[PDB]
């Protein structure tokens, strides 16, 4: 298979320029995937994911969120989760109009998994399948009470205020992945800001009450040795969602970024097998 990338943009909320990739395989389109990356990264850390999904006949749309990658906006700035979910919704609409006969898959990693979850509970009828990699759906369990207060009280007025260190050595146990993250000029190399912290707290604080609104099938992927987001949070998520077709795949010994781990091809084969049979 050859899966070709085309780069496009749209005006996001606040008239921020949002850049996105579309990855199109040279086969009949079996479904569309709308993909949300996580904190401080960007959609070009997902080329290999899009290429594997294309080998299965899937067209992948992947945006750089505001404040990330090639998109506009102050770096890592957000004042409400709805900014991220609104731009994600715009991308879902573009994909839906371009491929109106196709099933729609929403996929997110980490912060992006929080965004996709938040999207899905708001629009539970507007997608067919959800896939989450280590989703940030319990941020209140990951930061100290002091950090949570600071983020909650300051994340609208001073959204760029740094509140929390991120241990980038925890993203992957492949040192080349860590090095490529640290040397990427489009990655955020500073601390977690108050605005993103607040936005993720908005998702986490009510996850158990909102997750019952999910109805569509869900696959969650999580490495057991993830020190950034503990795996027990994904175990709790799958107990709270409404949908009967829900599965957590735990990967023994993997770090946070399961799609970038040495075992990534097995992880991705699992994702493709789960998706394909549900189309
Ligand atoms: C204890 O320290 C930390 C624990 C988790 C994270 N965290 N990482 C991501 C994330 O999206 N990525 C990590 C690198 C790449 O794989 C994508 C999101 C978060 C997160 C955490 C709290 C509030 C808000 C957020 Cl957004 C950061 C520091």
From Swiss-Prot:
| Species of provenance | Mycobacterium tuberculosis (strain ATCC 25618 / H37Rv)
What is known about what this protein does? Involved in the hydrolysis of exogenous host lipids during chronic infection. Catalyzes the hydrolysis of both monoacylglycerols (MAG) and diacylglycerols (DAG), with a preference for MAG. It hydrolyzes 2-MAG, 1-3-MAG and MAG with short, medium and long chain fatty acids such as 1-monobutyroyl-rac-glycerol (MC4), 1-mono-octanoyl-rac-glycerol (MC8), 1-monodecanoyl-rac-glycerol (MC10), 1-monolauroyl-rac-glycerol (MC12), 1-monomyristoyl-rac-glycerol (MC14) and 1-mono-oleyl-rac-glycerol (MC18:1). Induces an inflammatory response and cell apoptosis in the host cells. Increases expression of IL-6, NF-kappaB, TLR-2, TLR-6, TNF-alpha, and MyD88 in mouse alveolar macrophage RAW264.7 cells. Persistent expression induces RAW264.7 cell apoptosis in vitro.
GO biological process annotations for this chain's record?
Answer: glycerolipid catabolic process; symbiont-mediated activation of host apoptosis
Q: Which residues are responsible for catalysis?
A: 110 (nucleophile), 226 (charge relay system), 256 (charge relay system)
Pfam families to which the protein is assigned, alphabetical: Hydrolase_4 (PF12146)
Q: What is its EC number?
A: 3.1.1.23
Tell me if Membrane is a UniProt keyword of this record.
no
A GO molecular function assigned to this protein is: lipase activity
Per the record, pH dependence is: Optimum pH is 9. Highly stable from pH 7.5 to 9.0. At lower pH values, the residual activity decreases rapidly to 50% at pH 6.5, and it is completely abolished after 1 hour of incubation at pH levels of 6.0 and below.
Reaction(s) the record says it catalyses = a 1-acylglycerol + H2O = glycerol + a fatty acid + H(+); Hydrolyzes glycerol monoesters of long-chain fatty acids; 1-butyrylglycerol + H2O = butanoate + glycerol + H(+); 1-octanoylglycerol + H2O = octanoate + glycerol + H(+)
Activity regulation information from UniProt: Inhibited by the serine esterase inhibitors PMSF (100%), E600 (80%) and THL (22%). Virtual screening identified a tautomer of ZINC13451138, known inhibitor for HIV-1 integrase, as a potential inhibitor.
**Where does it live in the cell?**
Secreted, Cell wall; Secreted
Tell me the protein's name: Monoacylglycerol lipase
Q: How the protein is affected by changing residue 256 to A?
A: Loss of lipase activity
Complex and partners: Monomer.
Q: Which family does it belong to?
A: Belongs to the AB hydrolase superfamily.
Provide the taxonomic classification: Bacteria, Bacillati, Actinomycetota, Actinomycetes, Mycobacteriales
Q: Tell me which InterPro entries the record gives.
A: AB_hydrolase_1 (IPR000073), AB_hydrolase_fold (IPR029058), Hydrolase_4 (IPR022742), MAG_DAG_Lipase (IPR051044)
Example of a GO cellular component annotation carried by this entry: plasma membrane
Q: How does activity depend on temperature?
A: Optimum temperature is 55 degrees Celsius. The activity increases 3-fold in a linear fashion from 25 to 50 degrees Celsius before decreasing slowly at higher temperatures.
